[PDB]
Amino acid sequence: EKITTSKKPNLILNVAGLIGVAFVDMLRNCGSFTREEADEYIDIGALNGIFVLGRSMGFIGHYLDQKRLKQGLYRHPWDDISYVLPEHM
Amino acid sequence: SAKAISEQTGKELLYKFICTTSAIQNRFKYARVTPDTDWARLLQDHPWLLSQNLVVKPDQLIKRRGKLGLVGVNLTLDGVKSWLKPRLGQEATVGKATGFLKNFLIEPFVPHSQAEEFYVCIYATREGDYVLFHHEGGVDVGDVDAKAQKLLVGVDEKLNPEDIKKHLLVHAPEDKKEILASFISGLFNFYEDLYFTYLEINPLVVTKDGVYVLDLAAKVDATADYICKVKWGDIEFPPPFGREAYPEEAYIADLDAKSGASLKLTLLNPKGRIWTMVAGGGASVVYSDTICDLGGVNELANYGEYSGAPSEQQTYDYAKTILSLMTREKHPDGKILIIGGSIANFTNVAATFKGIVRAIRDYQGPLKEHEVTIFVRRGGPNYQEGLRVMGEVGKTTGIPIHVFGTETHMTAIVGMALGHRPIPGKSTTLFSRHTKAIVWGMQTRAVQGMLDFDYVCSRDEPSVAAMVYPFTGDHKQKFYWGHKEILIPVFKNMADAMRKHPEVDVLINFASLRSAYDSTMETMNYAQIRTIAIIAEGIPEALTRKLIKKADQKGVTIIGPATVGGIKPGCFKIGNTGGMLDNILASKLYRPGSVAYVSRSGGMSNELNNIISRTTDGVYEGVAIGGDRYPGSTFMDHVLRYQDTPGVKMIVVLGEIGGTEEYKICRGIKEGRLTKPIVCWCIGTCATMFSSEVQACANQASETAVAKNQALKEAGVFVPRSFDELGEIIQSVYEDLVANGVIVPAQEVPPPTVPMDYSWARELGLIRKPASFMTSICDERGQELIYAGMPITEVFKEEMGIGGVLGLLWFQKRLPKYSCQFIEMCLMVTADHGPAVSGAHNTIICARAGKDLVSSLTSGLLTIGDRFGGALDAAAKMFSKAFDSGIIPMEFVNKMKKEGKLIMGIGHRVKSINNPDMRVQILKDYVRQHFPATPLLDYALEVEKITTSKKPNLILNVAGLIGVAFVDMLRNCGSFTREEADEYIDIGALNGIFVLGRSMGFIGHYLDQKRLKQGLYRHPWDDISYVLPEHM
Amino acid sequence: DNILASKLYRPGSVAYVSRSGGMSNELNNIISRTTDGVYEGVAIGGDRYPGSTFMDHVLRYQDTPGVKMIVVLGEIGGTEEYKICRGIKEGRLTKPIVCWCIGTCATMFSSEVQACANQASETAVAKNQALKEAGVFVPRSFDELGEIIQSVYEDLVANGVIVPAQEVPPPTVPMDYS
């Protein structure tokens, strides 16, 4: 990210990249896992589970927010949709 | 550009990186001496200088220092330490300027004579590198350009031995000729691979012992820092001789290096009144020149500009720096801030304008006591608000304001401020109406502007045929032709773009300074492309040499790098040239005119668009060649291209300091190559009348602005006295050509209208749209992530956890620490309950079917409902319904018994009495010892005491305990009212608690099944009871 | 559109009081196009006894330094104009005042309904004469008010009491997306 920020200032380490690299380091260096175990957990989708469990809280918060604001049934505006249908087929 | 480096850096890179057969002693042998260093450290870590004699030199970029007497020869160490008393620590005036002396250099003295002293230099030029050798070294060199032997090495080639043997070194002793034949070749290779621009050894001593270097003059390509990062280490770029730079000037320099936007500032004397912080480099030059034209020769103080589309923070910091400088003096006559700028092409005027207005909003105190008034004249993208909100910002703050726009002269503000004005085979045709271009890089706004300009010009087809973006696959991107949708193809690779579009003649290169060179070389390999526009700035001059040579030997014209491009009204537009459609319509650039111009700056090109539009029938073609040392095309090329063009009738040129290109115009009009009227003006007349000008690289008096102006004036070129009446002469020449009948002006024809982009109209506050969605939990538009009114840093610094963030996101409340800990405990106890339950079973089945984590966890979660996982919410609901009514626990039990309905939250397979459920015990103990009041918990506990007499195992299980304790937490933590707590229970907050808790267990089950490598599951047939109809 | 046409987005120096609402817009237009602007313009409603009479708001304008000129429109019926003249006789009102009274038709028409004039000394012509030789610049009719009003403005910029502030563009109201 030093190199990329030298290319362009906003090319910084994301939350995603930081969490990924720090999680790989935590698996490889906390002393609880062998190298193959850490690689196995990275492969099978431990970080997918981390993101899913984190964002489940936000999604449930959004559900409770929409329920508490009494928001009605949503229908997308026709102006935001581009209908390109075949003429005869 | 090219910046000079200190002798230490040049010598260190020479010693470390030279590759020649010659023996080079004194390697790694020098001593940088400063008044602020410990002499014991230098004489201990570096004691090698004790053995021999010593030479002491000044080390702050002084030329011809031998004549000034600061060169010490044959001094012993004690004599050296004593020699610094009467010179160091005070001024040292040479020529006209003066400065301090606080860093000198120390060398080992060497015995030598004139027979061994040689002069060598290598310096850059458009055609390659001039290498000069001179026989007599020392202070007797005098003229070197016309005295030393001349040799030229071309662009991208090596030096053969023969040129050094019998064309460069023919006035030297034979053996020393042989040794130099390799030493100079090694020096040239060191010149090439280190990206030097000027490399001077004066003098060079060659001896059987080896080679000796005494003074080194090195100017290096700064823009090549990205390619020579390892080769340079930590290089230093010393400022020139004069007063030391202020700390705020160093801050501005650091800001310039922060991003790609240009930010220049220089000071002469902060005691002046006339202060200027306009936008645009060439524009800054023009305003500064106009200040000193009509009575500001010595009163002007600052010299600076901002460009490259500086962001909010760049102009933020620049405005506060100029304001901090603004207050530290008191001028009895008064003070004025004069800020102009031409019509910006791409710099978002709105953002920089917000920066300056908000920097004056918060900084109001120390401005009104100095009697400062502001004269502002700005144009460009979104200038309407730039002439609007300052109108009341300066009115409410209490400063006299004078804000004008494009209709007024760019230069009239200067006269107004001082009272002088009352306050009111290359081709000659590159672009046609049917030319098409390929844009390299993903520039949606630039291509959309191109298309809009094409539409208002009544072009048959859009001028953008294809886009090249390496980082995505081939696809097609939507764009707007007037009001309708069209698709422009975007390709991963350029070969396909050129293969599938053979009609493309132009390529606009939006590649960065690191990818522009390779892209242009790949382009010039394709013969259909006749014109290439290079937008990037910061390409090192050597790479530009190679581009220029390839283009010349391929016959392809290059619109030089570091340019906005050029515009041919009615036919074609390069990228962001001419601003957006507002300027295009304002300057009438949708129809051909009769005046063709050429300039370096891209902002002055847009100002020329304005001037020619309002003083002439318009512009026929305008080209900005870029502000680099070696533009891909020069002034003379485009002047010839215009002269050979029948449609062009007037030439306009904006020259610059340095370079003999306007002189090429002079001989072009001397012998009769150029016949059309030519109005040229060279900017930078303050170079010969200021202390020092950085923004070029003039060497003698034959490259300044006034010399060019006179050499063009008495040659046949209508040269104004200044930029004040350049437009007047354009008017005069245009009228002279109209009266003579050579040009007939065509009457105006309305252009086609273009619907305004919704995003751009939203940035001007012209459209209202209702919001279809409401959110309350998280705001992420701003700089900082906000969790229900609380920044993420505030969330983390007060030691919140999962529970606190959960409270913020679900309830928008600041729960007390015990409530957050209780929520976390509830998530812990409900995390998992084995694989036998319905949800875990479904998750395991879906995981063994090979599905991903989301699908498996989802399939498990979808069984959470009434029969599985709903006991928490049901228990809380029914216990709350009973407690809210006045019925006592005994009556509640009897009532539930009567309706044939079991009490949710009561019952356990095991854990009857004296062996209680342990999760219940932990949670109950925590709620006892931390909660302030637990009424519903006591009600449920009385119900449990009643039910554990009907049957020992009818205990308050974890679901009922969590439900009643959560209701108690909502009703008694103090962050909720009664109706809010009831509403959150009603909408299913406890459903969310259980789902979030059990999601961890389901993900754990998925990971477990993946790790165990369990195969696809099929339920055994013996476990299924098949009862089918006979034949129904 | 009317606010921008009459440039009613910025403070001015002129204030007027009347009952009818249409004339309020018309007089805003006339003043804004022949004078630096309107500091305040009010309509009190053409009823028998409006909540606030002319003199209440005229004295309010007199007490506020922001108002420099008073412009008044009269009407048939009521002795309000004569009471205003009585107030201005002794010097209670010192700032320049221009007033025109409409309703001369009640003196030269068969019958007028749109009020309730009683004597010939109360009708529009008598009120106009009283205001004319009572210190108030009264033209013959609505026709030429322009050069009567703007003139007063160039009077007070000749005296230097009013400093003209040039216009500053206002933020524009966005229009409906649909």
Ligand SMILES: CC(C)(COP(=O)(O)OP(=O)(O)OC[C@H]1O[C@@H](n2cnc3c(N)ncnc32)[C@H](O)[C@@H]1OP(=O)(O)O)[C@@H](O)C(=O)NCCC(=O)NCCSC(=O)C[C@@](O)(CC(=O)O)C(=O)O
């Ligand atoms: C050319 C450029 C767009 C620069 O290009 P950019 O760097 O922005 O875009 P990129 O190509 O993406 O470069 C980033 C590199 O990081 C890589 N990267 C991206 N994401 C990555 C990831 N996630 N991971 C890893 N890498 C990643 C990417 O691959 C690339 O790598 P690389 O190619 O190897 O370098 C721009 O700067 C420029 O020059 N002109 C702009 C347009 C123009 O016409 N202006 C002229 C206006 S006249 C003027 O100024 C005067 C005045 O002001 C006057 C007044 O105001 O008075 C006025 O208005 O007229």
Ligand SMILES: CC(C)(COP(=O)(O)OP(=O)(O)OC[C@H]1O[C@@H](n2cnc3c(N)ncnc32)[C@H](O)[C@@H]1OP(=O)(O)O)[C@@H](O)C(=O)NCCC(=O)NCCS
């Ligand atoms: C299709 C394919 C799986 C056949 O597998 P197979 O081992 O021959 O047969 P099955 O996988 O059904 O299992 C074999 C036995 O399990 C039994 N069985 C199947 N489901 C059962 C259940 N729920 N309970 C108890 N027994 C079961 C079958 O009756 C069969 O009985 P058998 O032991 O008398 O032969 C194998 O040829 C293959 O993998 N081919 C690839 C093509 C493919 O994937 N097709 C998709 C199938 S539509």
Ligand SMILES: Nc1ncnc2c1ncn2[C@@H]1O[C@H](COP(=O)(O)OP(=O)(O)O)[C@@H](O)[C@H]1O
């Ligand atoms: N190491 C040295 N020993 C003796 N004389 C030196 C040494 N270095 C420079 N000089 C003196 O400097 C003069 C040459 O100056 P030069 O190095 O070419 O430029 P500058 O004057 O800028 O240093 C010679 O006359 C020589 O006497």
